[PDB]
Amino acid sequence: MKIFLDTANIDEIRTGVNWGIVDGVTTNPTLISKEAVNGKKYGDIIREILKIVDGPVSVEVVSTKYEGMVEEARKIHGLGDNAVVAIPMTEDGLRAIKTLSSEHINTNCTLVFNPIQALLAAKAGVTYVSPFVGRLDDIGEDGMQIIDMIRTIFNNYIIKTQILVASIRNPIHVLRSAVIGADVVTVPFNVLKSLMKHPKTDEGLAKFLEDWKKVSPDGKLIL
Amino acid sequence: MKIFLDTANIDEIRTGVNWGIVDGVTTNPTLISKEAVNGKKYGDIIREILKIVDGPVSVEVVSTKYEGMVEEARKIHGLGDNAVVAIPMTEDGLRAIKTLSSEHINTNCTLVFNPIQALLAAKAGVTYVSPFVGRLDDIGEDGMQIIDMIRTIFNNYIIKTQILVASIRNPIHVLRSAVIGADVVTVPFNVLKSLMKHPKTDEGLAKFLEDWKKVSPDGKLIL
Amino acid sequence: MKIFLDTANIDEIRTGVNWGIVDGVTTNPTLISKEAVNGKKYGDIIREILKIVDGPVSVEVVSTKYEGMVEEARKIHGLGDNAVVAIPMTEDGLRAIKTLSSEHINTNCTLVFNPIQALLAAKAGVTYVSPFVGRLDDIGEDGMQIIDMIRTIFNNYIIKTQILVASIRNPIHVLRSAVIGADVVTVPFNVLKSLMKHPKTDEGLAKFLEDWKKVSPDGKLIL
Amino acid sequence: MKIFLDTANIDEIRTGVNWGIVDGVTTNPTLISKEAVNGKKYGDIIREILKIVDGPVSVEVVSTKYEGMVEEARKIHGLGDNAVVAIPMTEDGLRAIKTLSSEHINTNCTLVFNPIQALLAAKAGVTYVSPFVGRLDDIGEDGMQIIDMIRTIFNNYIIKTQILVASIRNPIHVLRSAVIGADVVTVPFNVLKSLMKHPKTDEGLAKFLEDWKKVSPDGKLIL
Amino acid sequence: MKIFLDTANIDEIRTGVNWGIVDGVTTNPTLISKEAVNGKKYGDIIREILKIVDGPVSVEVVSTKYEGMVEEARKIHGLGDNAVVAIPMTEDGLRAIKTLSSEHINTNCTLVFNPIQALLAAKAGVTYVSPFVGRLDDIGEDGMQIIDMIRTIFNNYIIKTQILVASIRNPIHVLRSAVIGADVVTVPFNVLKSLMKHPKTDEGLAKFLEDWKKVSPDGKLIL
Amino acid sequence: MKIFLDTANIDEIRTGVNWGIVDGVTTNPTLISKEAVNGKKYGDIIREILKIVDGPVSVEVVSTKYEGMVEEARKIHGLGDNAVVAIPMTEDGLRAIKTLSSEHINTNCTLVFNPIQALLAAKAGVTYVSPFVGRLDDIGEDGMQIIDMIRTIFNNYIIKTQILVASIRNPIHVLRSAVIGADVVTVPFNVLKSLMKHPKTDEGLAKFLEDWKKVSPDGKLIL
Amino acid sequence: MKIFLDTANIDEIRTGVNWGIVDGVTTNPTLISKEAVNGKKYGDIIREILKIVDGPVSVEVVSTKYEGMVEEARKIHGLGDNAVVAIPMTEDGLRAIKTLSSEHINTNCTLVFNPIQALLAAKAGVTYVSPFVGRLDDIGEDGMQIIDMIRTIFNNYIIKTQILVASIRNPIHVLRSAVIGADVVTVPFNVLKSLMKHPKTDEGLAKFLEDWKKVSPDGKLIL
Amino acid sequence: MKIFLDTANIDEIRTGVNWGIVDGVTTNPTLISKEAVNGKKYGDIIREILKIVDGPVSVEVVSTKYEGMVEEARKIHGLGDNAVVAIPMTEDGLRAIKTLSSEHINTNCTLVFNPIQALLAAKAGVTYVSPFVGRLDDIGEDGMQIIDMIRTIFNNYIIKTQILVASIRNPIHVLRSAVIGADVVTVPFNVLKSLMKHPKTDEGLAKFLEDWKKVSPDGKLIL
Amino acid sequence: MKIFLDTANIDEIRTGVNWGIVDGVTTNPTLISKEAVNGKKYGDIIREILKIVDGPVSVEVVSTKYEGMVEEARKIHGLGDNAVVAIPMTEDGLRAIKTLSSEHINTNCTLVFNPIQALLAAKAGVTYVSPFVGRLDDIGEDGMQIIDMIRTIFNNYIIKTQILVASIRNPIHVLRSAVIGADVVTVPFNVLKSLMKHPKTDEGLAKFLEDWKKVSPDGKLIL
């Protein structure tokens, strides 16, 4: 499972990228809008992310119309080989995805909320489909179930579209995604850092440190 | 499923290896601290285990910082081709693992307590991930469930990182590990011994031997 | 699933073999003791079974010590290519199996009562492992569960050791072994006989014969 | 799944075969004896069926002894390439099947009532095994469960013997057989007749016809 | 679970009732038509069954119109307190059932083929609902599933309408009905007889009787 | 399970009410708006339905504000004892429901789309909660699952609020509701009439009719 | 769960009763024939068992005809209040049970091999029904499944007939009966003995005694 | 299931209470510290909450020592009858709870992270136990599983301690709590507000409004 | 579920009892023998425990014979009302329990290793039955499964004997016991100590304290 950062915050991304545990980044108009304030240009935001992120960087078109989506997609594409064009799950989006796929421009179909939408996006030739599990959670349905079904459907049809779990709110979304076998999760920074942590890890380390001192007071390992 | 001995006790290791049932050893700073007494130096203990054990011998770094970890890892690695560098599940540890994995130094990510930690370790290129099941048990969480999920996650993504079940407390951790399909269990000596024993084996053998004496007074099998 | 006869009774063996439904034989010191009475020598009994039987014939060592097991194993092995050396699940047994396996001597680890013992035997390189299901039944534990677990464990690690279900008491052990997918069942002769039988088979055959008499008074099929 | 007709009634066979949904025929002494009346000879009935039916035609020996079974089997075999010799599940039958199998004579082990009998028949090399589900139903045991277990057993050991579900009484035996994955069902003609039928098919067809008349009073499709 | 005989055949009814295993009878226009031959009047047949059978005797109205149904139902009801008026699952039938239920005339809603039909019948106040399982089987639908769902639905709402499984074709319909907890099964005579039989009962009794003769030559039990 | 008609069409309601199978009616602004065209006043629509429907008639307030809801609810209430006030699942709705409940005015909380909303409505003291399963189906989630969960939640807390399955589109919604144990379903007229129908009922009746004629050519039942 | 001894061996019975773990005895004509040898009369054996045993003692009629069964039943009944009349599952047996039940004579319907037979026996008013699980095992059918089904059926209809599991061959029949919730198991003496035993019980007791000797050299507990 | 607000924010509480969907409030030292700023005193915040909330209001002791806990507990208790004393899951806490329970002071054992802790709190007589599900989620374990286990455990032992699911992060914690049957959830305000919301509710409401406009231009309901 | 301390260590018992989480104590000859050293007498240890512990205190007889067991049991009983006599699962033990039970002496059947032994003990009237789960774990069998089955068996027959899970090795035995619904667990002190603890409790408490200091530097709660 690939792990992306779901943010437009350059500091978070750079931190996560430095940790070596971020395989890519997904942004979205809202996320970018958070960072493009007080002088910051979304243009520079996107470019910087493209630059410092080795892996796929998803940037969403803003046009709701086919032609505008495809044009914006091409612009996004031209920004860097790692750019992935996020296209919303709409009639025009599916058209755009099919066209972009034919142009070998990587696509991420976003705002997916059920498995059939996911299937449609896959059938359009989308590289990634991004179901928003947290937003399903928000409305009283367990979002992860949609990921499970999409996984099954995609397995059924040997679909190559990657399932990119988005709207991840907590590490259990992440755990469940992994157990289900989703291809990618994209996670907010606060979730990302929580992923490495466990109080028994901290406790274990402290005890290891403590006992090592009995062997070597300076706490070094000389071999 | 491979079976390692989780000890720094040379006699236990020597005994288990002489049984031919020990596929490797895992040490940790605490286990080493138990043996590094009465003048025994940890450097000798480690080198001696490395000598006795054909298979992987996991030796944990003591540094908590990336640079110290890779420096220690390289020194550990220099002790013998069978050395595996145990690195804790920490941000620095993941960075160290990634670095070491590229240097083709075998690693074992230790102090793993949930499946996502294990996944992150695997994604850093770790050779083994060591979830500490007994320590989860200690806190009222069935540790084996984490192994099951890791197995599933690792199977989902054809992850080649080996699941090395650690903090093994009893033969059912071992049984469950095997049924789950964990790659390795590492077990304290008291556990290792227990694994081959069963009262019905003892009873059965005694009966066989008694019955044999009815047909061969000396208890011999002449063929 | 192979069906062995678990007996040293030559008549049973010759009969079973002649029925064509017996793929091998397991003996053990008790079974042999039953036959080696009134002047009958165990050595002749063993040799005769090796003769009558084309399939594997398991003969158990009696030594409890590694050196004696291996010496007796080689003598057993030397009696015929179909000889399989049964080695009890003990520390020395595992060592013996490892050695014998390296000498390409087929082995059968017997007196196995749980799946981890079976795993240890497989790990030592044993050709067959023989869990004793009836004896578990005897102590209020459903022995077949252990076969199920061993099957799973073996499947998990692509273990080629054959599961040879022993201490078979009834046709349901056999049925369940088959459904589980045990490699072999070794059954006493009375169980073997019962396997072919069913009241509806008898009834149906009688009815067929009766109906046929309406069309062929002398009960022949002339074509 | 193949569908055989379980009858010796020539008219039923001709009818079934003309429908094109009959893949073969199974007879048995009772079925044949029912047709071989008022002068009609069983030799003629058998030959006629073999002539009519392109696919396998199962004809059961009547001898209960190995020699007679094998002799009759060879006569049956010589009647046509599609003749399959039905042999009852008995000790002699298993012997006969083993011999016939080595002679590349297709066999069908009949009067099988549990999965272990089926396994024995497979082990004898039988081409088909015929568990009688309706006769189990008759005695208050869900006959199809036996098919399920046989399928599982056969799957376990990659057994090539075809499961030929016999004593089929109703289309649910047929449905369940298909869902289980039995290789063949053999069905009485009245069951065969029902399999193509469904009231909603009838209703849908009539509706289609009625609606079509709105655009083509003469009910034709001119293209 | 009650057991009714599903026949208009006085001899079968007389025989079953003499066995003391028949708790009632269901007739239907067809079953009655089978018996209303050679001058036998349906009125006699019905009255005779009513006379022989202590328990409920279900007699179906022939009218398809509400008024005719209630008129016939009242006449049926007048034939004896044990008469149950069978009314088909139709709009008029439901109206008739509701009316009759208020007049405290027992009713049996027949030709029920799905659980919602059964529910509607129950809601009309019907005493029994008779799903025709064999007729579902006939069309490639496991009829017993409908019984299971009706049982569940009826349990959900504490419905006192009795589930009367009809179109019973075999002893497994009966077995499954009992396991599901259907209130009543109505069975053709051939089925009723079969229900008490089992080859192991026959075999067991024969053996008992043979063994008894060893201790009591005359086969008597003198106490 | 109660069955309501989900319509404002007086003809449908009168037809269903005449069938005797309609326990109540739910209307909604849309449904009423369909009928209140070409002169028809919604006022008369509602009154007529109240009049001809013996059971609960749900009429939805139109105000989105608490006070208006409560006022409209009281008006609706005053229209007849069988009037039930439908209140949408909103903040004001819950307030209105709690107030109306305190006033012993029956309430139906509508536009419920998950189980927690249902729980909230129940906690407000609502008489019925109406999850709209078809509308969930419309958006690619199986609406019946929400009914299942609500049933479980309500069972958990011995909640007396009736689950009123609405947005019913087909008889399987109805079947599943019944199997789940929903208290009520409200169904469109086309669904309602389909509930009584089954082709095997029609076929069975025709056959019964046909065979009865063999007993009585005039097709009468004279008793 | 009651535990009966399935034997006519007085010594076994007296021993079992003295252990206090035997709640009754079932005999059958075979078991009695085993004891009624060398001058021992069945009548004395039966009377003696009735004496030794406080619980129910089942004695089987030998007549196969209703009148003889009932006559023998009354004689059996007349021997003591704890006498239970075993009646085979046959047509005449059911009639006999019905009659005897009406005469408040406790009955045990034996030679039951499927759940519908058991149901029929219960319906006739039988006190116990005795399904023979080992004999089903004998014919390749898991006999315990029949007990499970009977338990369910009996539970469904609140049947008070006690399920008396007979033909018990091993402690797993007993375990499974207990887990299923059979009312009674009747077990041969050798099974009875085995039920109390477990190697870990012996081991634990030996260890306790050994440890206690450290604190009380003469192994007494003096308080 | 009761729904509490997990906050010390008076405005949120007032808002939630005004919505009439808040059954109680839980505070904790952190939540109050958030509000007790800019001159605001924790004493006033607490008192204000108690006055505004009819339901239980949980206020946590700060002492870590038994005596400090019971003294603070009694002070908290004295503040109002609806005050519930929150006591952390510690040895001192259990002691305090037992004392407080005996003094009939309602208690809420907080910082519970596994089911056995919850059981210990229940056994101390705690009124509520508060497992922190989100904080388990935070560390990669599905916190709701703990609730499920506690529910089972409490059900097993008819424990009257209410399960108060805390650390609620999303509506799915809430949904799952209700399905499990937790007695209470305490939710942050943003979760509380989300619970009533669903896009289809909004859509449906808008559509109803729109359609009602067709029949009543002014959008009124006149009756 | 009650929680007993499985020890004869007075200091552990005092400590556990002072925590208020110890409901009783189980001793056994090994445990007692461990304490009864360096002059300390077992009579004194036993008496001291009985004095210290308010709840049941289990003390095991050492006699292996009925008379000795009963004699010792009565001495144990006379030591205090809370004394429970532990009796091993043996033939004599069952006899002793039956006698002691009739004398209203509370008993604990120990060294139980399967569910049927447990059932026998219950049938003897034992107050508690103590299956030893850790010792089953020791021999590669999941000990808790025995508890699950015993619970089921006991539930089936409404058995009042308390399931006292012994040989508890870890908190998961405890957790599983609680989830299964065992009446009692008896745990070694080190397990007892762990049950109250969780790292997140510690972490949460520290955080609560830290945050509280923001509103109360002295860390007090003045109300």
Q: How many angstroms separate the Cα of I16 from the Cα of each of H91, I80, I177, I188, I195? A: 10, 20, 20, 10, 12
Nearest to A17 by CA among A201, A189, A195, A200: A189
CA dihedral (F149, F155, F159, F162) in degrees, to 10, reads 60
Distance from CA of C115 to the nearest CA of E (A): 36
Chain centroid, CA F149 distance in Å: 19
Spatial contact of C63 and C93, defined as CB atoms under 8 Å apart: no
Q: How many other β-carbons are positioned within 10 Å of the β-carbon of residue F30?
A: 18
Q: To probe the interface with I, which of H58, H116, H155 has the most I CB atoms within 10 Å?
A: H116
CA distance to partner chain G, nearest, from residue E65 (Å): 37
Residue contact B116–H141, C-beta within 8 A: no
Question: Three-state SS for E206?
Answer: helix
Q: Write out the residues of chain A at the interface with chain H, using a CB-CB cutoff of 8 A.
A: 134, 137-143, 169-172, 174-176, 194-195, 197-199
Cα(first)–Cα(last) distance of chain B, in Å? 36
Rounded to a whole number of angstroms, the distance from the CA of A191 to the nearest CA of chain H is 8
- CA E19 to chain centroid: 16
Q: Residue C140: its chain G contacts at CB < 8 A?
A: 171-172, 174-175, 195, 198
- Indicate the DSSP class of residue H161: S
What DSSP line would sit under D106-117, residue for residue?
-EEEEEE-SHHH
Distance from CA of B2 to the nearest CA of A (A): 24
CB atoms near residue I221 (< 10 Å) = 24
Contact E171, G116 (CB under 8 A): yes
Burial of F101 (0-12, 13-18, 19+ CB in 10 A): middle
Cα I42–chain centre separation:
19
- C215 vs D76: CB contact, 8 Å cut-off? no
Query: Side-chain half-sphere of H141: how many Cα atoms within 13 Å?
Result: 28
Residues of G in contact with D141 (CB under 8 A): 114, 141
Is A203's CB within 8 Å of I199's CB? yes
Size of interface C-D (CB pairs under 8 A): 128
H helices of chain E, in order, are 10-18, 29-35, 42-52, 66-77, 91-102, 115-123, 133-138, 143-156, 171-180, 189-194, 199-213
Whose CA is closest to C132, among C86, C95, C193? Answer: C86
Q: Which of C114, C115, C140 sits opposite I114 (nearest CB)?
A: C140
Q: Please report which residue ranges of chain C form alpha helices under DSSP H.
A: 10-18, 29-35, 42-52, 66-78, 91-102, 115-123, 133-138, 143-156, 171-180, 189-195, 199-215
Tally of CB atoms within 10 A around G65: 14
The enclosing H or E element of D155 equals: helix D143-156
CB atoms within 10 A of CB A190: 12
Nearest CA in chain A to I202: A199
Residue linked to tokens 């990302």: A192
Judging contacts by C-beta atoms under 8 Å, the chain I residues touching residue G152 are none
Distance CA E130, CA E111 (A): 7
Give me the numbers of helices (H) and strands (E) for chain G, helices first please.
Answer: 11, 8
With CA atoms as reference, the chain I residue closest to B196 would be I139
DSSP code string of C127-156: SEEEEBHHHHHHTTS-HHHHHHHHHHHHHH
φ, ψ of residue B139 to 5 degrees: the values are: -105, 15
| φ, ψ dihedrals at B76, nearest 5° | -55, -50
CA-closest candidate to residue E100, choices E132, E75, E79: E75
Q: What is the residue type of E38?
A: N
G140 closest CB neighbour out of C141, C143, C175: C175
Length of chain I: 223
- What are the chain G neighbours of E194 within 8 Å (beta carbons)? none
Resolution (A): 1.8
Q: How does DSSP assign G2-59, residue by residue?
A: EEEEE---HHHHHHHHHTT---EEE--HHHHHHHS-TT--HHHHHHHHHHH-SS-EEE
Tally of residues, chain D: 223
In angstroms, what separates the C-alpha of H171 from chain A's closest C-alpha?
5
Question: Which ranges of chain B does DSSP label H, i.e. alpha helix?
Answer: 10-18, 29-35, 42-52, 66-77, 91-102, 115-123, 133-138, 143-156, 171-180, 189-194, 199-213
What span, in angstroms and rounded, lies between the C-alpha atoms of I109 and I124? 10
Q: Which helix (H) or strand (E) holds E174?
A: helix E171-180
- Which tokens sit at B90? 């920490």
- End-to-end, the C-alpha distance of chain G in Å comes to 36
**Distance from E190 to chain G by nearest Cα, in Å?**
14
Q: Residue A142: which of H134, H139, H172 has the nearest Cβ?
A: H172
> Quick one: I158 exposed, middle or buried, by C-beta within 10 A (0-12, 13-18, 19+)?
exposed
Largest CA distance in chain E: 70
Distance in angstroms (rounded) separating the CA atoms of residues H207 and E138: 47
Token output for C78:
């030397």
Give me the residue label for tokens 């952190």.
Answer: H30
Instruction: Kindly write down the DSSP assignment for every residue of F203-214, as one continuous string.
Output: HHHHHHHHHHHH
Please give the method by which this entry was determined.
X-ray
Pairing of strands C107-112, B128-131: unpaired
Which residues of chain D have a CB within 8 Å of the CB of F199? 199-200, 202-203
Q: How far apart, in whole angstroms, are the C-alpha atoms of residue F113 and residue H196? A: 10
Query: Domains of chain B (ranges plus CATH)?
Result: 1-223 (3.20.20.70)
Determine H/A contact with 3+ CB pairs under 8 A as the test. Answer: yes
Number of residues written out for chain A: 223
Could you tell me if residue H63 is left (phi over 0), alpha (psi between -120 and 50 degrees) or otherwise beta? Answer: beta
Rounded CA gap, D35 and C72, in Å? 66
Q: In degrees, to the nearest 5, what angle opens at C-alpha A55 toward C-alphas A53 and A61?
A: 85
The torsion region of residue G219 among left (phi > 0), alpha (psi -120 to 50) and beta comes to left
Chain A residues in contact with F114 (beta carbon < 8 A): 139-141
For residue C184, list its beta bridge partners. C2, C164
Q: Which residues of A touch B109 (CB under 8 A)?
A: none
Please report, for residues B2, C128, C133, E125, H119, the alpha-carbon distance to residue C110 in angstroms, rounded to integers and kept in the order given.
Answer: 21, 8, 12, 67, 45
Residue of D nearest to F201 (CA): D199
Q: Which amino acid is at H33?
A: S
Q: How far is CA G107 from the centre of its chain?
A: 13
What residues form DSSP beta bridges with B6? B26
Q: Which helix (H) or strand (E) holds H4?
A: strand H2-6
A221 → closest Cβ in B62, B149, B152: B62
* Closest among F10, F103, F18, F102 to F57, alpha carbons compared: F10
Minimal CA separation from H114 to chain B, in Å = 6
Q: Which of E174, E211, E179 is nearest to E190 (CA)?
A: E174
Q: Are D173 and D134 in contact (CB under 8 A)?
A: yes
Which residues are bridge partners to E189 per DSSP?
Answer: none
User: Helix, strand, or coil here: F182?
Assistant: coil
3-class state of residue A220 by DSSP: coil
Contacts of residue D96, defined as CB under 8 A and 6 or more positions apart, other chains included, come to D61, D66, D69, D70, D73, D87, D107
With left for phi above 0 and alpha for psi between -120 and 50, is residue C166 left, alpha or beta?
beta
